[PDB]
Symmetry: C2
Subunit: 413 residues, 2 copies
C-alpha cells in the first residue's frame, strides 16, 4: 500500500503479506493461496517486463475461465500496463482489428485458443509476443509456465492510471474500447459493498459468467479487495445439479444467475436440497416473473435477492433493485444508486417532465475515462457533460427507474 | 462530480439533486432534507469566502452536537477550506494554542460556546472572524442565520479536508491532516464490516461530533444519502435513548459497554419496538456476560467492535460477533484494507506471537501532522506508521493489545 495507492495489485501484496496461506482462488477443486498468486503474478510480470512491456503498454488476454486470466490481468497491472480482455468467440480478423486499435504487442492466451492468436499475428504483425497457458515454448510461441519459471522492480501506479480496456461488442463501425482506471474499479467495488454486504470471515465468491466480460471481471473486485477467496467456474453447459453440488462443496455465499437459470436451480434445490451457504442471490440480464421471485425467496429463505442494472463496458452499475421492492415496484430496475447522478433528458439535453420517457444520462466517478484513442466517439458519449446510456427510461415520484423497450420474439427474431 | 471527484461535498450535491426532499439530518425531532442542507451549506460557504477565506485556509468549529456542525464542515470543504473541529472542553488558552498552530482566522461557534470564542480572540487576535450559530449579528459577532440570509471549486480527492488535533497535547499540539481520499477509504471500512441497506437504514451519532469517532459516524450517511440522527450531548438516560432509537427507526448505534449494560437492562424490562441491525461497542472492555446479554436483548442483530481509529489512524482491526467469545480480550483481526507489522525498536518483525509495537501501512492513514515534519517523520519512521500500541498476534491473526488497567480510586 506504499505511496498511498489503492488498486488490486497493492491489495494482492497486502494479502500475500498478511495471510499468505489463505485461499485466493479456487478452480476445479484446486486452491491457490495469496502467496502463490502473488508469486506467479510477480513472475509473469517480470517475464513481461523483460520482453519490453512497460508502463501504459497494452496486454491482450484471450482466455476462458481459469486462474491464468486473473494472473494475467494482475501481472500486466503490476508493471503499470493495461490489460485488454478479449471475447474468445471473436474471429481472428475481429481480434486483429482490436490489436491495431490499441496497438498491443503481447497476447496472453491458452492452448485451446493458441491457433486463434497465431492467426491474429499473421493478419496484424503488431502482435509479436504470444504466451500460451498450458503450452510449451515452441513454434515461435512462449510457454506460460516456462516464462514464470524463468524469473519485478516496484512501479508507482497512480489511482487514475488506466487498468483495463474493455472493448464494446456492438461492433457497428469503428471499435470502441472503454478505458477503466483503478479508481473506477475501486468505486465499482464500493457499490458491491453497500448493496450485497460482506463478511470478512466466511464469504466465498463465485464468477460463472465469462471472465472477459465486465460482469466476470466485476465479480473479482470484492474478492481481491477484501482478501476473500473466489471460485472460478469453468465455462460450459449449464447443469443445475452440478452447479448446486459445487456451491455446496465450496461454501459459496453469493452467486449471480439469469432468471432462466434460477428457475432450473430452484426446482433442482427444492426437489433435492443441498447444504448451501448462500447469503445473497443476484439476477439480471432478463426479466424475472413475479412467481419466480417468490419461488426463489421460498427456496432460499434467509437470503437477500438483488438485481443490478446499467453496468456496461462504459458504465458501472447505475441502478439497484433490493429484494424489498421486487414486488412493490415490480418491473423496475430499481433506484439510482447513491454514488451515481442521473437525469432523464430529451434530444436537446433538457430534463423531461417527471414521469415521462427520455434517455437516462449519468455523471459519476465510476464512469469510463474515454474510448481509447477515439476523441470523437468519447465526445459524443459525453455530449452535454453527461454520459449517454442509450436507454429510454422513465422515473417516477419515488425515484424508481423503468426501462422502456420493445421485447424480442425468438421464434421470429 | 465535476472532474470525477469523490468527497462528501459532491455527495451532498448529488443527493440534493436525486432526492432533495429525503431526510438528511434528524435533530431533536426536526428533519433537514438534502435540499435544505445543501442550501444552508452553500449559503455558509458564500458567507465564508466573503471573509477572504479560500482554498487551503483553515476554519475552526467550536460546537456541540448540532446540525450546524455538519453544515460548517461541509461549507468549509465546499470552498476548499480545511475544517478544524475543536474539543469544546478546552480552555480558551488551549484553543488559542490550536488557533496559533494552524493559523486560523475564522471560528464557527454557537451561542452556548460563544463566550469561549471571544476569550480566544482576546488571547489571539488572529481570530478576526467569529460566526455564532443561534446568535445575532452583534458587535464583533457574525450572526449565523444572518450570514446565511445574504462559483464552483475543483477539489482534488487528495485535498486536506480536516485537521484533527490530538487530546494528549504533551506540550506541542499535533494536528492530523486527513484528506477526502482518507475519509472515503474510512467510509469503505464501515461498508464491508457493518453492511448497509440503502433504503431503510438510519444512522446515529451520539459521541461528540468533534471527535474522529463522531465525524466518522457521518461518513456512511453522507456517502449513501441516508439519514443520520444527531443526538444532543447531555446526561445519559437509557430509557430516553431507547425511546429515540424507536421513534427514529435507528438501524445502527455505537455505545460504550457501560451504556450497553444500562440499555440492555432497560430494553429487557420495558422493550421498545426497535429496528436495530448492527450493534457497535468499544473504547472499554466488555465482559463475557454483557456480550451474551446484548445478543439475547437484541437478536437478529450483528455485534461489532472496532479498534485502532485515532486522529491519525483509521480503524485497523475489527472483532466480529462470532469471535468476541472465541477470542475474548482480542481487538480482532487486521482489516483487509490495512497492512500491519509487529516490530521491535529496530523496525524488525518480532517472532509471531511475541509482543511488539504494531505499525501500519494503509491509504487511509493521515497525510501528516499539520506543519510538523519532525513529528511526521517520527510517526512514519522506517516507512510505517507507529501507533504506539504494544500488541501480540496469534497464529490465527487475532491482535491482543497489552496495557495496564487504570485504577479509579488512585
Amino acid at each position: 500500500y506504499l505511496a498511498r495507492r489503492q488498486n488490486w495489485v497493492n491489495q494482492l501484496e497486502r494479502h500475500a503479506m498478511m495471510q499468505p496461506d489463505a485461499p485466493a482462488l479456487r478452480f476445479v477443486g484446486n486452491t491457490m493461496t495469496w502467496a502463490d498468486l502473488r508469486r506467479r503474478v510477480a513472475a509473469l510480470a517480470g517475464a513481461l517486463s523483460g520482453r519490453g512491456v512497460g508502463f501504459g503498454d497494452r496486454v491482450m488476454i484471450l482466455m476462458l475461465n481459469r486462474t491464468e486470466f486473473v494472473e494475467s490481468v494482475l501481472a500486466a497491472n503490476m508493471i503499470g500496463a493495461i490489460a485488454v480482455p478479449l471475447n474468445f468467440r471473436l474471429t481472428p480478423t475481429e481480434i486483429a482489428v482490436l490489436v491495431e486499435d490499441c496497438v498491443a504487442h503481447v497476447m496472453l492466451t491458452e492452448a485451446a485458443l493458441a491457433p486463434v492468436a497465431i492467426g491474429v499475428r499473421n493478419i496484424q504483425p503488431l502482435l509479436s509476443v504470444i504466451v500460451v497457458a498450458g503450452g510449451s515454448s515452441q513454434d515461435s510461441v512462449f510457454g506460460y509456465e516456462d516464462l514464470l519459471n524463468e524469473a519485478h522492480e516496484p512501479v508507482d501506479i497512480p489511482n487514475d492510471s488506466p487498468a483495463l480496456i474493455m472493448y464494446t461488442s456492438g461492433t457497428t463501425g469503428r471499435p470502441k474500447g472503454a478505458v477503466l482506471t483503478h479508481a473506477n474499479l475501486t468505486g465499482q467495488a464500493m457499490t458491491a459493498l453497500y448493496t450485497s454486504g460482506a463478511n470478512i470471515n466466511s464469504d466465498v465468491g463465485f464468477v460463472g459468467v465469462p471472465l472477459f466480460h465486465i460482469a466476470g471481471i466485476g465479480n473479482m473486485l470484492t474478492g481481491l479487495l477484501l482478501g476473500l477467496p473466489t471460485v472460478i467456474y469453468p465455462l460450459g453447459a449449464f447443469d443445475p445439479g452440478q452447479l448446486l453440488d459445487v456451491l455446496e462443496a465450496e461454501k459459496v455465499t453469493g452467486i449471480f444467475l439469469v432468471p432462466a437459470q434460477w428457475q432450473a436451480v430452484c426446482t433442482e434445490q427444492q426437489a433435492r436440497p443441498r447444504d448451501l451457504r448462500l447469503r445473497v442471490l443476484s439476477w439480471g440480464a432478463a426479466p424475472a416473473p413475479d412467481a419466480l421471485l417468490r419461488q426463489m425467496s421460498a427456496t432460499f429463505p434467509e437470503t437477500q435477492i438483488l438485481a443490478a442494472f446499467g453496468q456496461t463496458e462504459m458504465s458501472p452499475v447505475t441502478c439497484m433493485l433490493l429484494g424489498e421492492d421486487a414486488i412493490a415496484k415490480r418491473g423496475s430496475v430499481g433506484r439510482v444508486i447513491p454514488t451515481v447522478a442521473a437525469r432523464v433528458v430529451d434530444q436537446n439535453m433538457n430534463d423531461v417532465p417527471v414521469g415521462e420517457v427520455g434517455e437516462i444520462v449519468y455523471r459519476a466517478p465510476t464512469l469510463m475515462s474515454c474510448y481509447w484513442n477515439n476523441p470523437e466517439a468519447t465526445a459524443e458519449a459525453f455530449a452535454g457533460g453527461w454520459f449517454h446510456s442509450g436507454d429510454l427510461v422513465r422515473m417516477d415520484s419515488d425515484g424508481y427507474v423503468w426501462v422502456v423497450d420493445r421485447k424480442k420474439d425468438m421464434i421470429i427474431s
